Amino acid sequence: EKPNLIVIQTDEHTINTLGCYRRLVGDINDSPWGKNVVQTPNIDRLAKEGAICTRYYASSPVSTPSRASFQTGLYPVSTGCPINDMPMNPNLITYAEMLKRDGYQTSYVGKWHLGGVPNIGRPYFEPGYNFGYMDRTYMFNDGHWKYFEIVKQPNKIRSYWSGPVKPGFIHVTEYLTDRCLELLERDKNKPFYMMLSIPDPHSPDIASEEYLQKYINLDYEAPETMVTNDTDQRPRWARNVNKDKFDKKALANYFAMVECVDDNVGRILDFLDKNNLTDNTIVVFTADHGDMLYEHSRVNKGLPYESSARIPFVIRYPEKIIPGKIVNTVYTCVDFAPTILGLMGVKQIPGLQEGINDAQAFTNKEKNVKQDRIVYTTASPFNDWTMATDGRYKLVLSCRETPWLFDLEVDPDEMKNFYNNPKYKEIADRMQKELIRQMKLYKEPALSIGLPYLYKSTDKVNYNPAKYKSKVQPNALLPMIHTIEKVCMRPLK
Amino acid sequence: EKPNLIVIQTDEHTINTLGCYRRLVGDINDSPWGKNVVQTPNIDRLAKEGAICTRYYASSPVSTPSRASFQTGLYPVSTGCPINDMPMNPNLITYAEMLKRDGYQTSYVGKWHLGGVPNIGRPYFEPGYNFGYMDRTYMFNDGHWKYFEIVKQPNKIRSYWSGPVKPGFIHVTEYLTDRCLELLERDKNKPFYMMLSIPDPHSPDIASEEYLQKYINLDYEAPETMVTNDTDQRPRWARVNKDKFDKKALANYFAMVECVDDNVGRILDFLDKNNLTDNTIVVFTADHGDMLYEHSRVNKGLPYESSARIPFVIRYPEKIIPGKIVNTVYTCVDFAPTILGLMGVKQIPGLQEGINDAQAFTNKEKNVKQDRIVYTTASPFNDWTMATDGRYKLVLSCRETPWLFDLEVDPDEMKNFYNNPKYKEIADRMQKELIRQMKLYKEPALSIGLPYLYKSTDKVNYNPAKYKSKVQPNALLPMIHTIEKVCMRPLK
Ligand SMILES: [Mg+2]
Ligand SMILES: [Mg+2]
């Protein structure tokens, strides 16, 4: 009996907003922002009835590069899309194409960000190459709107970022979930692969008023990693919101968005239970990247810090995954395709897979799983930092700062550098040798660009991003391309 | 046994630079520019040994839209790329994909213009989706550079617009022809489909000195269709005066065509030596033509015959009788259905907005003519639409009142017959068909709400800026271009 696959992805979602991750490091009611943190009962069910990954990271803490690595089993340079808005190479084979080729009905509902399509001020559905997704009716490339209006039935939709909900407006999280439930009912009696990518926790921290009412008046605490000018000891790749400008209204909005998400994940899980698909359906809860959310005095920033770099990875496969399993092995989005295809018995993406198939970690009987492994992450807009982690030690190399070594056992809040401590010399050496080796193997763009990285603490910063930029002539035809995309390619009539 | 397919396509190539088309309308040594016109012996061989199409037009007289229509059997709006630099829909099936599905080894050497990839100052090889093409090593998206230099063997090339020529420099036409022949030798004993798209005629008009010396000092005459500021009676959609005629540019254009024709001979000589002529279909065509000083215009995509018409010569010795002339009107939308019908290959699944007229080439008629009207569209601004039955050409526009052309009575297209009472019924039946086809093929002008004039009494009230969009610039493009040059398409 071929297992079904449902992947639920969020955008800019910090693991600290999930109770499953907060309980792993302490009380579920303690958070960087205190006790009024959002509770995630429905997502936490997947952890309780399955496996939680404590060291899952984005290949790059930016949307397009991470999403690309999740589909391809490849680092962002080999996907064609290391920067946002770049098209993913249409010739590359995705895990969805492998599922399609094994007789699976494939559907994507939500934000793609891999099609390279223009912004038309409204959701751009069916964007770019299918990449193995048969139903892309409710797949749109990019947008931060919170409300949708349905002008024509298929997917002719007007989008709105803010404002009260007008009479025919639907909150996007509910809409996309409602659409996914419909496709799930149609394919419940066949091998099906559904991916719902919800964009809500993302940047425009604007939430539904029925969710905001529950958080706007509550009290929140500024994260203890927040800085003041005289207490700023952060690396320069992270030097912004000082403790004085911590915004509790934006925090309440983010918490309200996460509750809408968890409620809507529950409707998907309630459906599976009612239609008896829980046992033979693999459910994954994940995100493209996380959010600093005022931690380290940063917000919405692609950083090697845990809150931004780390992504939630919770998987429930009742048949082959024991409940309460914790996988501590370090992983990136490059590992998803080989691992998910191995777990489902499906053939691997042919040729180069720069990741590992660790389906054994979930299929074995060990309640706590850890393998000795190092993984590397990359910076998206400017490739200005690189990072390697073994689970406890995190090494950051940059053209904007001298090397930084973090110890999560001794300093979980990543507030101190241990690179120059002679007691950590062997660790630093091992981590630096691996980062350089992985940088060369996975074609780190910084090496091709010749960025001035500092591999020694004696080095000085000499970096102007302008020298590595290629100024570009503006296309005079784009004003007319935008018109034909709106009125001809994606018409509201 | 499955026939081979070789398609040779040029860029911005007027039919009047081909002697096959010049002899169908007058003397071969008679041109709008005089008797010093380029002679095209090798391309003329395909007309003599096969069929010539007297009324073949581009779907849109602009590169990306016409190229997309040729591959997909669809008008440019349905290809995803009605305008240049827009990418073709990667989900669409091409005739190459249908050939790949029937065992054909498929290859493209030259300019694609459908991948939507960025300009990197050098050729961008392997551009975007394969679209049924299995060898795209020498397929580059866009660029009209005259010389290539090979830094690293596969496809790592630096490009020159026109240099004093250094030792490593290879002229693009010869380079691309050299690579096609290398791929043709490797697949000669298997069913093969090769397309060679040469960008040469389309250009900043710069030819190799070996070919330019043959034309730079000769004498050329300004076309009689040229106008002065005081004798201009052209439609406003076409509004280079005489005296701004550039014979040096013309010489460069003719020298470019002679290099092309010589290089087509090498492909034809290869087929003859390897005995592949009889079971290989060879097609010579172009995306669109060039006004080349005719109607006092040079490179503008217009409904005039020099821009709108495309060369279409086809030789299949097994099924096509030598000397055939097909006068049925066609657009590039018709190629895929017809080529697949001719090769006995499954038609592209789903909607085809064109016809499979392989019977016209296979039949016993030396002069084929069936009643049909076809339509062409304007690429950048959808400002004009055209319909033709072969003799009468109707142009509708937002910049001018309706224009009816009679190519029997006025082959130089200088007069309007729409408001001639003898042509009232023909104009009415032509306009009805244009509007019917415009609605059927989703003409963008109707969707944009452009102010098209459907009566001679109408007045032009059109502001293009009212229909154009506001475009914010992308901050990331500077860094994306660096990644493309150093990571995606490196010279090292
Ligand atoms: Mg982002
Ligand atoms: Mg052009």
Nearest CA among A203, A5, A209, A19 for reference residue A111: A203
Contact assignment for B83 to A381 by CB distance below 8 Å: no
Question: Which residue from B86, B91, B477 is facing A472, i.e. has the nearest CB?
Answer: B477
Question: Which residue from B91, B485, B490 is facing A129, i.e. has the nearest CB?
Answer: B91
Of all helices (H) and strands (E), which one includes residue B78? helix B76-79
Only one residue has tokens 């020529």, namely: B165
Residue B317 CA, chain-centre distance (Å), reads 24
Which two three-digit tokens encode residue B188?
Answer: 């000669």
Cβ contacts of residue B177 below 8 Å, gap of 6+? B196, B198, B263, B266, B267
DSSP output for A171-240 = EHHHHHHHHHHHHHHHTTTS-EEEEEE--TTSSS----HHHHTTTTTS-----TT---GGG----GGG--
Contact assignment for B478 to A486 by CB distance below 8 Å: no
Residue A215: what are its φ and ψ, rounded to 5°? -130, -25
Nearest CA among B296, B299, B470, B448 for reference residue B383: B448
**Which residues of chain A does B129 touch, with a Cβ-Cβ cutoff of 8 Å?**
90-91, 129
Residue B272: what are its φ and ψ, rounded to 5°? -60, -45
Scanning every residue of chain B, which has its alpha carbon at the shortest distance from the alpha carbon of A442?
B487
Only one residue has tokens 């039919």, namely: B15
> Residue A6 carries which DSSP code?
E
Contact assignment for B469 to A486 by CB distance below 8 Å: yes
Exposure string (b/e) for B112-122, b if CB count within 10 Å is 16 or more?
bbbbbbbebeb
Query: Long-range contacts of range B267-272, CB-CB < 8 Å, 24 or more positions apart?
Result: B267/B6, B267/B8, B267/B177, B267/B180, B267/B181, B267/B184, B267/B196, B268/B42, B268/B45, B268/B46, B270/B181, B270/B184, B270/B185, B271/B6
**Which residues of chain A does B473 touch, with a Cβ-Cβ cutoff of 8 Å?**
474
> Residue B285 carries which DSSP code?
E
Query: Distances in Å between the alpha carbon of A478 and those of A176, B138, B340?
Result: 30, 28, 35
| 3-class secondary-structure state, position B37 | coil
Which two three-digit tokens encode residue A69?
Answer: 């690595």
Query: Distances in Å between the alpha carbon of A101 and those of A72, A184, A326, A352, A368?
Result: 15, 19, 32, 18, 34
| 3-class secondary-structure state, position A471 | coil
At position A229, the amino acid (one-letter code) is N
Contact assignment for A85 to B444 by CB distance below 8 Å: no
At position A370, the amino acid (one-letter code) is K
CA of A76 vs chain B CAs: smallest distance (Å): 11
* Chain B touched by A488 (CB under 8 Å): yes
Exposure string (b/e) for A434-470, b if CB count within 10 Å is 16 or more?
bbbebbeebbbbbbbbebbbbeeeeeeeebeeeebbb
Resolution reached, in Å?
A: 2.4
Helix axes B172-186, B247-273, angle to 10 degrees: 10
**Which residues of chain B does A470 touch, with a Cβ-Cβ cutoff of 8 Å?**
478-479, 481-482, 485
Nearest CA among B85, B90, B177, B96 for reference residue B135: B96
Helix axes A172-186, A248-274, angle to 10 degrees: 10
Only one residue has tokens 């790059």, namely: A60
- Using CA atoms, how far apart are residues B477 and A105, in angstroms rounded to an integer? 36
Cα Rg for chain A, rounded, in angstroms?
A: 22
* Sheet arrangement for strand B147-152: B156-160, B147-152, B169-171
Residue pair A216/A131 in contact (Cβ under 8 Å)? The answer is: no
Cα–Cα–Cα angle for A474, A475, A479, rounded to 5 degrees: 115
Nearest CA among B108, B123, B120 for reference residue B71: B108
Q: Which ligand is nearest the CA of A62, by number?
A: 1
- Using CA atoms, how far apart are residues A24 and A27, in angstroms rounded to an integer? 8
* Chain A touched by B473 (CB under 8 Å): yes
User: Following CA atoms A288, A293, A294, A295 in sequence, which dihedral angle do they give, to the nearest 10 degrees?
Assistant: -60
Of all helices (H) and strands (E), which one includes residue B59? none
CA of B80 vs chain A CAs: smallest distance (Å): 7
Could you tell me the domains of chain B?
Answer: 4-368 (3.40.720.10), 376-466 (3.30.1120.10)
| 3-class secondary-structure state, position A418 | coil
At position B489, the amino acid (one-letter code) is R
Q: How was this structure determined?
A: X-ray
Query: Distances in Å between the alpha carbon of B10 and those of B259, B264, B288?
Result: 12, 11, 8
Residue B277: what are its φ and ψ, rounded to 5°? -60, -45
Other beta carbons within 10 angstroms of residue B228's beta carbon come to: 10
Nearest CA among A197, A159, A264, A175 for reference residue A63: A197
Nearest CA among A299, A237, A288 for reference residue A58: A288
Report strand pairing: A4-10 vs A192-197. Answer: parallel
At position B226, the amino acid (one-letter code) is M
Q: Which ligand is nearest the CA of A308, by number?
A: 1
Exposure string (b/e) for B422-439, b if CB count within 10 Å is 16 or more?
ebeebbeebbebbbebbe
- Using CA atoms, how far apart are residues A106 and B131, in angstroms rounded to an integer? 22
Residue pair A57/A394 in contact (Cβ under 8 Å)? The answer is: no
- Using CA atoms, how far apart are residues B173 and B199, in angstroms rounded to an integer? 8
- Using CA atoms, how far apart are residues A427 and A4, in angstroms rounded to an integer? 42
* Chain A touched by B455 (CB under 8 Å): no
Which two three-digit tokens encode residue B165?
Answer: 């020529």
- A153 burial via Cβ count (<10 Å: 0-12, 13-18, 19+): exposed
DSSP output for A262-323 = HHHHHHHHHHHHHTT-TTTEEEEEEES----TTGGG--S---SSHHHHB--EEEE-TTTS-T
**Which residues of chain A does B481 touch, with a Cβ-Cβ cutoff of 8 Å?**
470, 472
Residue pair B468/A483 in contact (Cβ under 8 Å)? The answer is: yes
Residue A322 CA, chain-centre distance (Å), reads 25
- Using CA atoms, how far apart are residues A481 and B469, in angstroms rounded to an integer? 8
